[model samples]
Target chain A: SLAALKSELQALKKEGFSPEELAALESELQALEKKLAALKSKLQALKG
Target chain B: SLAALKSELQALKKEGFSPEELAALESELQALEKKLAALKSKLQALKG
Candidate 1:
């Protein structure tokens, strides 16, 4: 899943990034979060 | 940007994951890649 990726991104958030990089990172994270949620739901659907 | 996140996700691809989990992870990465590209485009737009 996104567990490892999310953790890494969380830590990366503490590091300073350029304004443009920050904007890009924010969008990337948002999309990742949404996909993570969808994946969880799919996993549940598969299990159930 | 998604450099750190992408690196982490790339590493995770080596680990064993359930089919559902793998599917979810694949989808997650695809979305991240797309967003990352979009962000780069946006940054270029801002720069240009």
Candidate 2:
């Protein structure tokens, strides 16, 4: 159900982010990229 | 974990978005607001 909430969020993210919301979204997107990069560094880490 | 998710997302989008992802995020944000509005309306429909 919690993942569903994120699914909802993902759906919303797909729709369109406003200037203000996009600013926030952009910030989040950046973090996701970095997290991915870091996690990949550790062979034992699973993808989130 | 909640705030961490947001922080993680921020790191994801450094370079830029594919046109699709940008469009999707925008839509997602709009969907969330629309859902909020509809919920408010429903609750207020027969207000005391």
Query: In lDDT terms, which candidate is top?
Result: 1
| Model 2 C-alpha lDDT per residue in residues B1-48, reported as the tens digit of each score | 223433443454453534455444445444444544443353234232
lDDT of model 1, residue A28 = 71
Local accuracy of candidate 1 as per-residue lDDT tens digits, A1-48? 334444544555566435556556566757766765555565456457
- TM-score of chain A considered alone, across all candidate predictions: 0.55, 0.48
| Candidate 1 residue pairs in clash (backbone atoms < 3 Å) | none
Give the lDDT of residue B13 in candidate 1: 60
Residue-by-residue lDDT tens digits, candidate 1, B6-35:
454455566544555656656676776676
TM-score of each: 0.39, 0.33
Each prediction's Cα lDDT score? 0.56, 0.42
lDDT of 2 at B11: 52
- DockQ (model 1, Cα): 0.15
